[PDB]
Every structure is written in structure tokens, then in C-alpha cells.
Amino acid sequence: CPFGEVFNATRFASVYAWNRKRISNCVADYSVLYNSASFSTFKCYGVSPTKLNDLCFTNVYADSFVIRGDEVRQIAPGQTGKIADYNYKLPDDFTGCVIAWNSNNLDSKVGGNYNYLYRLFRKSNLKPFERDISTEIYQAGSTPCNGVEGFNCYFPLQSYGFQPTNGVGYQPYRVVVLSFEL
Amino acid sequence: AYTNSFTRGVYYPDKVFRSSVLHSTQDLFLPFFSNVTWFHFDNPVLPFNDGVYFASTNIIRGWIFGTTLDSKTQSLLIVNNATNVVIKVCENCTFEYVSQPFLKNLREFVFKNIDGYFKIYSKHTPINLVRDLPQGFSALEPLVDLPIGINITRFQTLLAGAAAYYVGYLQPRTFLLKYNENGTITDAVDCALDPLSETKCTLKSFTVE
Amino acid sequence: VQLVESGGGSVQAGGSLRLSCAASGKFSHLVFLGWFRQAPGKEREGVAAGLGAYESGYYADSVKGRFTVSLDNAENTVYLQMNSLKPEDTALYYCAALVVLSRDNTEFIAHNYWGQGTQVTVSS
Ligand SMILES: *[C@@H]1O[C@H](CO)[C@@H](O)[C@H](O)[C@H]1NC(C)=O
Ligand SMILES: *[C@@H]1O[C@H](CO)[C@@H](O)[C@H](O)[C@H]1NC(C)=O
Ligand SMILES: *[C@@H]1O[C@H](CO)[C@@H](O)[C@H](O)[C@H]1NC(C)=O
Ligand SMILES: *[C@@H]1O[C@H](CO)[C@@H](O)[C@H](O)[C@H]1NC(C)=O
């Protein structure tokens, strides 16, 4: 029942403001999952992708965002890269199912889509499931030049840009992280 | 004004059913012989501190939970206004809830709010004479599990000769519940109070030698 | 949810304008990212930022001490003031609005939106 909306939705959230659409109290058949030509990475951790119809699990969370090609392998439990250090952390014990498919027909304009930003610099090293929506300045270098914003301090959000002539490594991949515990 | 809660404030920490076994759990409990404030103007806004033990002897109508109680933040005014109780979290409505009412007696409640869930326990033991908080041990059963998760750090009691209500603060200390044959709790020792009562938690009984 | 800009046209250098980004639709907070300046054939740069809950004025060095933003919570809008116009500031400006439809604490349904485009052509 409850998660046909989170997959086929027109637009998806960006990495800093990750959606956390929460589903409960209907049967989740999973028969439209794991056998579909659209998907590209179905790597469940701590639970097999098979034998998921025959369990019953509670407080299942369904995260969502969009990331580029060579950033799918940073949604693993661990693997501190760029977007797992500051933007989206999956805690070490995870019990989940990262579902990272491909979308280049929907998320690329003629001059490039700019609606899917991310957080490049951040002073804080993150905690698991910790949103960091605040946009305060980063102060690169021990330097008190605060209000100038020219150099030695950075506005942390930065845009991706998705042109359809780009390679496989930088097209956007609409991940969806079904997370559930007992 | 301080009154000494003797041994009260023990709820069922889980949802399973055990029988005649001495379980050892670690959660937020009211400490034994902890100083509880008598409140005989009457209602200053008090902090939360991850859990408070409300206990009053119909004058009490309810409680108001929030951050600063304006139109900016979502409130939580648990009020027993009608013949049934209602719960409003609005200020713009996100949630509401109606159930059987919560209403001499001794009304006890243990509020706790951890990780998006709002838990609330209850008990209704009767008492005639005023030992202010009686010595008898009785458990508490949960009423509802509320997954709303508004960040609450202030609470203030609704109201309507002075009336009494006590509030004692919870702490992360571990207990040792004695479950009975039927499945009820009839006694509990504290694992952090007395150097006698530590030895009852590392010998797994109620008797030492 | 759309976005609406104003304050555009062709105006002589050393004059003044006022840039306004107007929002609509259904939301709950509308936390602003800010104004973004994109020179023609260049990348957009974060000319204006720091408009969250707890914030501070973020202005780039090229317009530092010359342009000012203001938080207008009446329509959840923003006003960018124009002082002492200079053809280096000739750009198609954008406002960046983070909408949020999340009335709960947990289910943070919050897409990310941008505006339309402001034609700012100034010259001496
Ligand atoms: C989205 O639509 C496709 C094609 O109809 C379908 O195969 C897929 O299961 C849908 N996803 C969900 C879960 O809505
Ligand atoms: C109590 O308050 C609720 C709203 O929270 C209202 O719907 C109900 O009618 C009230 N009952 C009375 C009449 O006390
Ligand atoms: C209530 O919701 C509206 C949007 O529907 C919002 O503008 C307002 O700030 C919220 N808070 C109040 C004042 O009730
Ligand atoms: C259990 O309940 C029954 C029926 O109320 C009662 O007769 C019995 O004494 C109870 N036993 C204990 C140990 O509580």
C-alpha cells in the first residue's frame, strides 16, 4: 500500500533536506520491488532482499534524495566520503535497503537543472540521521575575515548541475533508503 | 517545600509478560527516597528534564506541554475537558486524539518523551489519610504510545482552600523488579541507593546473607 | 508552489532598484537560502545568504557594504536593496527558496525550489 508515492514522485528532495516520509499500518508486498528493470542498486544490509515479504517490521522509514553517479557507494554503512561526512549518515548498524536507481530523463534540463543542491564544506562532522539544514559560513583557514565571504570562508551549499550530455559518473541517481528496525 | 517519596514511581518498562522472575532493567525511573516538591500563583512553568513524576490526589484538569506556549511553536495541552479525555498538539492542526478519560484517590502519572514517542503511565490507588505520598508499592500501566515528537522542555498544569500536586524528576538509574505469579509487579529494589541495596542487584535475589 | 520576482528593468548606473522574491502555495517555514547572482555565461555565486532561524548577513566581497537583504515574514518574502548601480553587477538574479510541507517533526517532506529570473541590465 503506502509507498507507491515515494518512488514515482515528480521531484525529489536534495541531499541536505532529505525527505523522511514515514510509512506504517498497511501490508507492504514488495512484489513491485527487486524485480523491476528500472532499478540499478538494491543492496540490503543485515536483511536479505529475498525473505522480506514474509517478515513483519515496524516503524519503517523511507528516506529520499538525489545524488550523482560516483556517490552511490557512499550510502553504505561507513565509507566516509564527502556526502557521508557532512550530509547524510547511515549509522553503522543499519537494517535497511538502499535502493539507488537511475533517472536521467527526468532530472536534466537544457541548460542544466539546479534544483538539487548539496553541502560541500561543513565544520561539523555529523551524527547518524542528523539533518544539518542550517546554512551558516565555514571559515576556511584560521582567519577572522567573517563578513566578506570572498575567500578563507565559504557559503557551504553548492549546486550540482545536470546536463544530459554528461557522463555516467555525474548523472543523478534518485536513491531511496528504506530503513526499518524492530 | 520538600516531601519524601518513599518507594513509589515504578512502571512496566516493557510490553512483554513475565512470570515469577526477577527481571533487571535499565531505564528512566524515579529514585527511591528522592526529594519531591510540594506545591500547596500555584502553577509555575516547570522544566521537563527527560521525565517528571506527576502525582496529585475534580480539581486537576490537565497539563500543558510545549517550548514557550505561543502561536509560534506547537503546544501539547493534555486536558480532560469532556466526559472523555482529549489531547491537542495544535496551536494549525497536526494531530488530535480522543480516548477514555483519565480523571479519596491518588492519581499518579509518569510522563516521558524519548525519540519521537510520547509515553504516559497511570495508576489509581485509593488512600484516605494523608501520609502525603503513601508507602505502598503499586505498579503503573501505560495508557497510550504517542508518536508525535514535538521537542518538549516545559510543562505547566491546567487547573480550575489550596490543592496539592507533586512533581519529582526522573534520572537514568536501574532497578530490579519482582514480578509475581499472575504477572504484576509487587516489589523493586534500587541498584544505586544503599550499599546494602547494591548487593541485592549483584546477587539476583531479595535476600542476602 | 511557485516563486515570483520583481524589481527588473533597464536603469542607469548609480541609480537604485529593489529586488523582491515573492512566494505562494502551501508551506510551513520557507527557510530562505538567499539571492544568487549569475553573470552571463558564468556560474551562479552565493551573493546573499544567512536567512535561516539563527543567521548572519552573508554578502560577497564584490558587493560588500553596498547591497542589503531583509527577512519579510508577512508573505515569507525577501527584499534586496540596490545602492549605487555598477555594470559589474549586471546579472540574471535568482532567489532560492527551500519549501517545506512538514507539519510533523519526523516526516520532513521538503522539496527545493528556485525562482524565475530578473533582467538587471545597468550601464553608465
Ligand atoms: C512506478 O511506475 C512503474 C511503471 O508503472 C512501476 O513499475 C513501479 O513499480 C512504480 N513504482 C512505485 C512503487 O510506485
Ligand atoms: C473538549 O475539547 C475538544 C477539543 O480539544 C472539543 O472537541 C470537545 O468538544 C470539548 N469537550 C467539552 C465540551 O468539554
Ligand atoms: C500556521 O500555518 C501557516 C501556514 O498555513 C503559517 O503561515 C503560520 O506561521 C503558522 N503559525 C501560526 C501563526 O499559527
Ligand atoms: C491472581 O489472580 C487471582 C484472581 O484475581 C487471585 O485469586 C490470585 O490470588 C492472584 N494471585 C496472585 C499471586 O496475585
Author numbering:
A (entry chain F): 336 to 517
B (entry chain A): 27 to 66, 79 to 95, 99 to 132, 165 to 176, 187 to 243, 261 to 309
C (entry chain B): 2 to 125
The article reads:
SARS-CoV-2 enters human cells via its spike protein, which is capable of binding to ACE2 (angiotensin-converting enzyme 2) receptors on the surface of host cells. S1 contains an N-terminal domain (NTD) and a receptor-binding domain (RBD) that engages the binding to ACE2 receptors on host cells. Here, we report a synthetic nanobody (named C5G2) obtained by phage display and subsequent antibody engineering. C5G2 has a single-digit nanomolar binding affinity to the RBD domain and inhibits its binding to ACE2 with an IC50 of 3.7 nM.
